[PDB]
Amino acid sequence: NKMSPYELVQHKEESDEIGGYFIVNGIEKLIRMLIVQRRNHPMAIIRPSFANRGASYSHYGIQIRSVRPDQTSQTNVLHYLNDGQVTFRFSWRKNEYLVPVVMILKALCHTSDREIFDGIIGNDVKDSFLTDRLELLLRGFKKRYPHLQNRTQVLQYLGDKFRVVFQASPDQSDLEVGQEVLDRIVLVHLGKDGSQDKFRMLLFMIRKLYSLVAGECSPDNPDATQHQEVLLGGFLYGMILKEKIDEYLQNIIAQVRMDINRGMAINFKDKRYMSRVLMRVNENIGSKMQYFLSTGNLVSQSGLDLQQVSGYTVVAEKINFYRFISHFRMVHRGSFFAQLKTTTVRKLLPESWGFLCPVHTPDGSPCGLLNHFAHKCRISTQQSDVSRIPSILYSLGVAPASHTFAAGPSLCCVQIDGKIIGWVSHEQGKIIADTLRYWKVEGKTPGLPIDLEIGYVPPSTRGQYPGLYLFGGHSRMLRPVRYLPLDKEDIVGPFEQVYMNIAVTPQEIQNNVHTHVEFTPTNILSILANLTPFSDFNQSPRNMYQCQMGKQTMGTPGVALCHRSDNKLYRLQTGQTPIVKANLYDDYGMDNFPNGFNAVVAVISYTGYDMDDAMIINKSADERGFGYGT
Amino acid sequence: SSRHGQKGVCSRKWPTIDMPFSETGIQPDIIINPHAFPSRMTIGMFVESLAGKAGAL
Amino acid sequence: SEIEIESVQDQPSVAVGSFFKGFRAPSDTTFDLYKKKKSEKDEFVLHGENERLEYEGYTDSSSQASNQYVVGLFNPEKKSIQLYKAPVLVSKVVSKSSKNLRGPKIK
Amino acid sequence: IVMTASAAIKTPQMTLPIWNDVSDEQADTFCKSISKVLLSEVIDKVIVTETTGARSYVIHMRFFDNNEYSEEYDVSKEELQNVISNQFIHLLEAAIVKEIKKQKRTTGPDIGVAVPRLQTDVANSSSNSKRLEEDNDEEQSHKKTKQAVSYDEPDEDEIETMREAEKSSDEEGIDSDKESDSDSEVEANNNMNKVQRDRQSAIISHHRFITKYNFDDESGKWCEFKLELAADTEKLLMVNIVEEICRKSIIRQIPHIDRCVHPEPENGKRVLVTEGVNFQAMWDQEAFIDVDGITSNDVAAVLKTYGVEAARNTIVNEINNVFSRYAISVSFRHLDLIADMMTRQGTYLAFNRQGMETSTSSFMKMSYE
Amino acid sequence: YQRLRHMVNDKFQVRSTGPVNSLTMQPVKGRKRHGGIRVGEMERDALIGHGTSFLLQ
Amino acid sequence: SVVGSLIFCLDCGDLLENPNAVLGSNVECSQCKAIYPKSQFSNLKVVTTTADDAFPSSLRAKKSVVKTSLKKNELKDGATIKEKCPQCGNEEMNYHTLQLRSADEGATVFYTCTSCGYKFRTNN
Amino acid sequence: RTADFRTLERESRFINPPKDKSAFPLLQEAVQPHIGSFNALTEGPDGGLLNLGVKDIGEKVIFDGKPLNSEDEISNSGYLGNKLSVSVEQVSIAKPMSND
Amino acid sequence: KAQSGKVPIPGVKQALEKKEGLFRKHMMGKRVNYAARSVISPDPNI
Amino acid sequence: LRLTAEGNKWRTDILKTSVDTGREAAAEVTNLDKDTPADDPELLKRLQEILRDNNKSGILDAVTSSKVNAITSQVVSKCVPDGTMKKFPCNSMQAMALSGAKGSNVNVSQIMCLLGQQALEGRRVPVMVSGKTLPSFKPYETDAMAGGYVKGRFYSGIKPQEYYFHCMAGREGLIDTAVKTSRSGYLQRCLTKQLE
Amino acid sequence: FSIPDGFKKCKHLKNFPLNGDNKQQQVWLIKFPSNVDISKLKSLPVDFESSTTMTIDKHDYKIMDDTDNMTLLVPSESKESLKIASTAPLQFDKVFSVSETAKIPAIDYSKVRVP
Amino acid sequence: MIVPVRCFSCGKVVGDKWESYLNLLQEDELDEGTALSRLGLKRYCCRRMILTHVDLIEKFLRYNPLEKR
Known part of the structure; x- marks a missing residue:
């Protein structure tokens, strides 16, 4: 860990040992990163396979992926039926359970039925589309469940129907189970002691549903790289590790209950009884975590929020160094999307500018599916101090979300990390978003970290749902640009980037449009797509192919080769540096791993033996050693 | 392969003497066919060829 | 366009309710006004009740930290206002008739 | 064409050669006579004022101007009267009593019961868990060292429609797909004439809920009626009921034919293109169309109508469209x-198991599949 | 220039009598056993399409 | 309080029962015990319009201000080159580029004739 | 000049590996997504994500099938027994060592 | 047409019906003696 | 590969006439007139209307594509035989295209003149939700270059914006690489068992 | 009531002179972030437009009106009782909002775009 | 690894000029241009073989399995 290149040499490693991979039965394997939906932000998806689920389901819907503070996900879809009925979908074990939304909303807090009506219909009281869809929702509940007159009596009801499925205990009352359903499922990025904020978000998510079915909100594309983030390696590794030490607590219960299926000897205050129980449970969890890394098979009876069960870990290859340093810079959309033959997910988009490399993707079957990150694209690792941001929005023009009672696209819902904190206008919203960017890159205000992304979305005729979204959490995608006031550095994510104006060179900065400029136009490329010499002169399928040819060269795997035991190593003997090279060749230290040699090359058709991609090597060059390798 | 996606197999280890020598006396190590260039448009290789010769001199 | 100040008042006399749109209680009602003793902009609690309805309210633990509200009283002659540092009681209303539960498990 | 012998092509067409003495104005007006007109296509707005007391729904329709949809569609305003009063309200009051029958019976699920699966396929949950990440220089390394040009599951719906056909029996659980089918039992105008008052009287007397009706016969610009339903009923999204029924109510459809269009001619052939096949109906339009x-391109329709030699010549003409489009000249x-x-049996057989059945040699049959 | 790791050293084979299979008495699959070049389904159709009956036999 | 076709209580904010599904002139709250047998708010209208994107037709597209339909001959690919069409001696011919095969294959150029209209296929 | 190969700086670094700090710091910023992700399991606020995660799965309980043998009251018949509640409150990955 | 753990024992009927099996693998698609394969190479002098 | 100094003077001036082409097409499609300026707010309302429809905005991507493809074929028609430094026999680049040895006149034009309109899925460059085709461009930028018209060439280089759009068109053919394989395999077997 | 501890109740409230005459009275609901001390501010520049440039102790302040629910409460005589202001609820007349602003600087376009 | 003995292209003996070249850049503080011409490397096929050498052997020699540490 805290170790010098001199000490890595003495302890039988390379002097620039990179790490980041597990050694499992000798084979070096690593956890592949993924692309999943951005956390804590209600997307506005339309999807044709919701009417394939049941009768009168529309294709409309609101989908939120809520993460807990231990990085465990929970996805809640909010459907729209053609009745006017609105439901609430979740998945608890591997099953899939639906509930009416006013059964949640009247269980989250004590609600007058107009505070449901006012929370959705904030103003725009006289909108005929909207005040009619909602009196099929309050009326349709009071009709169907007429014996629910307050908050506890629906928690009595909901904990009764959901008692067996949560494997709840016979001492728990129904409002202890029914409270646990609302603490384990709905909008869990707010947690316990956050019932009012889980109630403000669902009323936001209902107007976003109703403003989607009215065609006032463009549907959010879940491939558009502003609505998706990175599931990191070790974060997955501690999501599966929680579920294995949850099965360990269940096998203790399953072992004690198989002692009261018999009648042997049970006193739960006996120390020697406990050791008899715990010597029988298979407690070798580190073999269940090795088996994940050994195979890739995510096996969990609990069921994680990810929709495949394979390919989570891959073999870190060492056929050269360019192959190896590109595994750690590789991201993937998921194994579920290669099954399709609709090629929308494979298409390169403008919102991947500086986050995903346009060049460095594999030719062939994972073309578009297996893109790599760009050069200066840093992924967030921990979250930031956001407990001081609400006090700074209140110093600005924000009226709080506890007093205002006003919703819909006519205003600018200020949210940080998926918690609605207040409401402003749209003209005030752009001033708040811009002063926060000036207070961020000017590092004077204590509560603004530089990694906070300020996602202002201005209003527009039938565009994206306007608001002001601020994110600071884990696993985001960040890259630096130069803010044009102060000539500082600004950390910009992909949700921000759609509505900003980032000039490429300084010479192209036009007046009164650009607030940001790139540091270098080479920051949008990969590592390996950036080492192609003069790569703006080739045709684009030829830059993408060097990114596949260069991984498969035989070069230098490393210099500590007398202390390893690998299935295959290819090693080029006589490497040379390039005379023609990029300056990022030196910054990554690719001289330690010479991949290739210089050759006096004559472009000539002389022999007749070279057509159709054939080449002629010199014989005496070969005899004197020329690309010799073992 | 060069660094521009111009891969090709070795067709023949061609002997030294019957291979075009230069005014300088240099004989090339690799002969590449000029017909591989129009269909591929790798002009990053035509500029690498005279940037690596200026840099060697 | 300037307007001066009549007077400055600190002590809690005036409060502001935050109810649903159209909360029109029977006007024979009194309100309790509580205050947690911690010597800054403190968190206040409402309570008030008639024979049929009953309600408590409270201030927001987050937004009462660094956002503060003032009630002003303007004489158009004198072109100056007097100030009264008022909280906001974010309040709900419960029904005294309907507070029943059931057998708390399936038994 | 070659496989599966499609009786139902997904996009059937019909090329109608117009005469030499017909003109281009006469031909575009002719396309308007054949092309189907949904009643949705002549409506600008529908303004539903719902009031209560009996739930008195008032439906006001705003058509486009009469000089506009009579050019765009060649639809007279008398035909709008003769579709609203005789097809639309029969569909509208059918959708209402269906929706009140939904109101009393089914309004609530069972909370706590799991619904079935969400987004998995019918099989294997993915294409391949490991081979789906093979690049074309690595996947051509696995298809060079072995004879691996085959595909186990060739991944086709026509193969699946060749896997799914030819049902079990008529003595099954459902013999003819039987179900219940039971348990049924601005402006401010007035001053109609005697005619529109008496048209309204038999319109109310032949529908279930009409109770008032009017139609703008002077301009053809609006329509108006007042569905006054029961008082027991509750809130009902009437505008979503109307938007479905307007998109389904046909004004003028020649059957099996959706839309005709007059494209740019290839080599002096003034022709039409008809999205659908109905040979029998185009025979009665000989004043504009050379019916000979x-x-x-629906070969199973030319077989049924013109015999087996015209079905044969359609096959060689429609295989050639596939190759001459890509500038590929097969002989x-x-x-x-x-x-x-x-067409060796006089029918339209394809190359499949069903076509191969009428054959002499059995080792050809056993070795196929 | 660069040199790629996938090389043509593990490609060729030649068969003259070889080991056979036990059920069908046909030549055996395997570059390790050095036998079994496959005249498959499509290569049979080429030999019918030439009309040569004794190259198919 | 009356908002739209809805009516709410002034005490518990509760949605009142539909004033014509009940017996004669007595509606009350269920959380509160409301005092409305007066039925003072009877007649309620909700004027609702269909959507402006609800009935799509070719006549509505002409009511748009932007152009919604290219005409018979408003599309001519100007990307032309003097590739000789030999079936009539035509020089001007349209073109269009892609990369279909693996990325070790030359560019695929898609030609299109102008006068005779006879198509051509060019691999490399 | 335009670029330079660092042909005395390379050779002085091959012979003498750096004793204080790694050269080429952009190569350790390439895997900071991977290493920092694993570091958050055992470090950061709340003792990492694993100690913060074992409390989201708090209690797995059962009961016995034996009475309290109290007086004849209504809690004597509808009674399960004494109640264990097994829990995990701290998880600690050690470091690779070896033992014999 | 019998019952099987996950994938039961193959019967004599199911040894016959796919691309593999018998009737297409060993009757239309036999492997031959006196054959060879190799990488090909260009030559203008033949 | 190099043009002569006269011929390199021509293509600068012919491409100087395409700086005002993305707006003449954008004002034609919206049925405005008299050359409304690019930042006219009524135009920016109209261009947002054709951003939200898919049967529109291929209208703008067929008008503006044809209106810049003319400037593409005016540069080719004046430069590649006559503005080159080396004429036909000695220019081996042209002599490999005219012979049919390897290449075409399209390949020679993208080297010496300009790449041109990089057209995606038949239409043109895709746009964001914000009316921006890259983060470097103004929203609803009426320009040929913002719509993906590469005025650069492979001899001199393509700018970082138009480098990116050519990477989009390089990928849309490469998704039709894997769907090629098992199309006609089963179709030909099923013919060759009957016609056998 | 007052079930979590610490909730001192209030007894010695002052009298808010809401007259109800007919000179006249207007009841406002001005707003402040807590960073400014209200005794130390003396005037209050307020306009019906946003033209409300105020600056206190090197801090740019901005008073914003928004004409287009919150209920005023006043004590009875001395006991708390906080009864609802009305005439027969009370809607206010004007609501204001002090907002701290900053001046983002003009981009020095001469230095920042080098040819 | 170690310096090649001969030039690949022409064939002039190059492997005796690597330790001389590192003195011409350290002691004499010359550029790469004059340090090659003083050693007699005058054809650019053999100038590019001293100029471009990586000398990876000094990185391989640090892993000695035949001595302690």
Whole structure:
């Protein structure tokens, strides 16, 4: 860990040992990163396979992926039926359970039925589309469940129907189970002691549903790289590790209950009884975590929020160094999307500018599916101090979300990390978003970290749902640009980037449009797509192919080769540096791993033996050693 | 392969003497066919060829 | 366009309710006004009740930290206002008739 | 064409050669006479004022101007009267009593019961868990060292429609797909004439809920009626009921034919293109169409109407469209031999298990599949 | 220039009598056993299409 | 309080029962015990319009201000080159580029004739 | 000049590996997504994500099938027994060592 | 047409019906003696 | 590969006439007139209307594509035989295209003149939700270059914006690489068992 | 009531002179972030437009009106009782909002775009 | 690894000029241009073989399995 290149040499490693991979039965394997939906932000998806689920389901819907503070996900879809009925979908074990939304909303807090009506219909009281869809929702509940007159009596009801499925205990009352359903499922990025904020978000998510079915909100594309983030390696590794030490607590219960299926000897205050129980449970969890890394098979009876069960870990290859340093810079959309033959997910988009490399993707079957990150694209690792941001929005023009009672696209819902904190206008919203960017890159205000992304979305005729979204959490995608006031550095994510104006060179900065400029136009490329010499002169399928040819060269795997035991190593003997090279060749230290040699090359058709991609090597060059390798 | 996606197999280890020598006396190590260039448009290789010769001199 | 100040008042006399749109209680009602003793902009609690309805309210633990509200009283002659540092009681209303539960498990 | 012998092509067409003395104005007006007109296509707005007391729904329709939809569709305003009063409200009051029957019966699920699966496929949950990440220089390394040009599951719906057909019996659980089918039992105008008052009287007397009706016969610009339903009923999204029924109510559809269009001619052939096949109905339009020259790509329709030799010549003409589009010139001697093999029984057989059945040699049959 | 790791050293084979299979008495699959080049389904159709009956036999 | 076709209580904010599904002139709250047998708010209208994107037709597209339909001959690919069409001696011919095969294959150029209209296929 | 190969700086670094700090710091910023992700399991606020995660799965309980043997009251018949509640409150990955 | 753990024992009927099996693998698609394969190479002098 | 100094003077001036082409097409499609300026707010309302429809905005991507493809074929028609430094026999680049040895006149034009309109899925460059085709461009930028018209060439280089759009068109053919394989395999077997 | 501890109740409230005459009275609901001390501010520049440039102790302040629910409460005589202001609820007349602003600087376009 | 003995292209003996070249850049503080011409490397096929050498052997020699540490 805290170790010098001199000490890595003495302890039988390379002097620039990179790490980041597990050694499992000798084979070096690593956890592949993924692309999943951005956390804590209600997307506005339309999807044709919701009417394939049941009768009168529309294709409309609101989908939120809520993460807990231990990085465990929970996805809640909010459907729209053609009745006017609105439901609430979740998945608890591997099953899939639906509930009416006013059964949640009247269980989250004590609600007058107009505070449901006012929370959705904030103003725009006289909108005929909207005040009619909602009196099929309050009326349709009071009709169907007429014996629910307050908050506890629906928690009595909901904990009764959901008692067996949560494997709840016979001492728990129904409002202890029914409270646990609302603490384990709905909008869990707010947690316990956050019932009012889980109630403000669902009323936001209902107007976003109703403003989607009215065609006032463009549907959010879940491939558009502003609505998706990175599931990191070790974060997955501690999501599966929680579920294995949850099965360990269940096998203790399953072992004690198989002692009261018999009648042997049970006193739960006996120390020697406990050791008899715990010597029988298979407690070798580190073999269940090795088996994940050994195979890739995510096996969990609990069921994680990810929709495949394979390919989570891959073999870190060492056929050269360019192959190896590109595994750690590789991201993937998921194994579920290669099954399709609709090629929308494979298409390169403008919102991947500086986050995903346009060049460095594999030719062939994972073309578009297996893109790599760009050069200066840093992924967030921990979250930031956001407990001081609400006090700074209140110093600005924000009226709080506890007093205002006003919703819909006519205003600018200020949210940080998926918690609605207040409401402003749209003209005030752009001033708040811009002063926060000036207070961020000017590092004077204590509560603004530089990694906070300020996602202002201005209003527009039938565009994206306007608001002001601020994110600071884990696993985001960040890259630096130069803010044009102060000539500082600004950390910009992909949700921000759609509505900003980032000039490429300084010479192209036009007046009164650009607030940001790139540091270098080479920051949008990969590592390996950036080492192609003069790569703006080739045709684009030829830059993408060097990114596949260069991984498969035989070069230098490393210099500590007398202390390893690998299935295959290819090693080029006589490497040379390039005379023609990029300056990022030196910054990554690719001289330690010479991949290739210089050759006096004559472009000539002389022999007749070279057509159709054939080449002629010199014989005496070969005899004197020329690309010799073992 | 060069660094521009111009891969090709070795067709023949061609002997030294019957291979075009230069005014300088240099004989090339690799002969590449000029017909591989129009269909591929790798002009990053035509500029690498005279940037690596200026840099060697 | 300037307007001066009549007077400055600190002590809690005036409060502001935050109810649903159209909360029109029977006007024979009194309100309790509580205050947690911690010597800054403190968190206040409402309570008030008639024979049929009953309600408590409270201030927001987050937004009462660094956002503060003032009630002003303007004489158009004198072109100056007097100030009264008022909280906001974010309040709900419960029904005294309907507070029943059931057998708390399936038994 | 070659496989599966499609009786139902997904996009059937019909080429209608117009005469030499018909003109282009006369031909575009003719396309408007054949092309179907949904009642949705002549409506600008529907303004539903719902009031209560009996739930008195008032439906006001705003058409486009009469000089506009009579150019765009050649639809007279008398035909709007003769579709609203005789087809629309029969569909509208059918959708209402269906929706009140939904109101009393089914309004709530069972909370706590798991619904079935969400987004998995019918099989294997993915294409391949490991081989789906093989690049074309690595996947051509696995298809060079072995004879691996085959695909186990060739991944086709026509293969699946060749896997799914030819049902079990008529003595099954459902003999004719039987179900219940039971348990039924601005402006401010007035001053109609005697005619529109008496048209309204038999319109109310022949529908279930009409109770008032009017139609703008002077301009053809609006329509108006007042569905006054029961008082027991509750809130009902009437505008979503109307938008479905307007998109389904046909004004003028020649059957099996959706839309005709007059494209740019190839080599002096002034023709039409008809999205759908109905040979029997185009025979009665001989004042505009040379009926002895109409050409389809639905081979199973030319077989049914013009015999087996015209079905043969359609096969060689429609295989050639597939190759001449890509500028690929196969010979006609190869296309004649396939079309003579597909029509060797006098029917339209394809190359599949069902076509292969009528054959002499059994080792050809056993070795196929 | 660069040199790629996938090389043509593990490609060729030649068969003259070889080991056979036990059920069908046909030549055996395997570059390790050095036998079994496959005249498959499509290569049979080429030999019918030439009309040569004794190259198919 | 009356908002739209809805009516709410002034005490518990509760949605009142539909004033014509009940017996004669007595509606009350269920959380509160409301005092409305007066039925003072009877007649309620909700004027609702269909959507402006609800009935799509070719006549509505002409009511748009932007152009919604290219005409018979408003599309001519100007990307032309003097590739000789030999079936009539035509020089001007349209073109269009892609990369279909693996990325070790030359560019695929898609030609299109102008006068005779006879198509051509060019691999490399 | 335009670029330079660092042909005395390379050779002085091959012979003498750096004793204080790694050269080429952009190569350790390439895997900071991977290493920092694993570091958050055992470090950061709340003792990492694993100690913060074992409390989201708090209690797995059962009961016995034996009475309290109290007086004849209504809690004597509808009674399960004494109640264990097994829990995990701290998880600690050690470091690779070896033992014999 | 019998019952099987996950994938039961193959019967004599199911040894016959796919691309593999018998009737297409060993009757239309036999492997031959006196054959060879190799990488090909260009030559203008033949 | 190099043009002569006269011929390199021509293509600068012919491409100087395409700086005002993305707006003449954008004002034609919206049925405005008299050359409304690019930042006219009524135009920016109209261009947002054709951003939200898919049967529109291929209208703008067929008008503006044809209106810049003319400037593409005016540069080719004046430069590649006559503005080159080396004429036909000695220019081996042209002599490999005219012979049919390897290449075409399209390949020679993208080297010496300009790449041109990089057209995606038949239409043109895709746009964001914000009316921006890259983060470097103004929203609803009426320009040929913002719509993906590469005025650069492979001899001199393509700018970082138009480098990116050519990477989009390089990928849309490469998704039709894997769907090629098992199309006609089963179709030909099923023919060759009957016609056998 | 007052179930979590610490909730001192209030007894010695002052009298808010809401007259109800007919000179006249207007009841406002001005707003402040807590960073400014209200005794130390003396005037209050307020306009019906946003033209409300105020600056206190090197801090740019901005008073914003928003004309287009919150209920005023006043004590009875001395006991708390906080009864609802009305005439027969009370809607206010004007609501204001002090907002701290900053001046983002003009981009020095001469230095920042080098040819 | 170690310096090649001969030039690949022409064939002039190059492997005796690597330790001389590192003195011409350290002691004499010359550029790469004059340090090659003083050693007699005058054809650019053999100038590019001293100029471009990586000398990876000094990185391999640090892993000695035949001595302690």
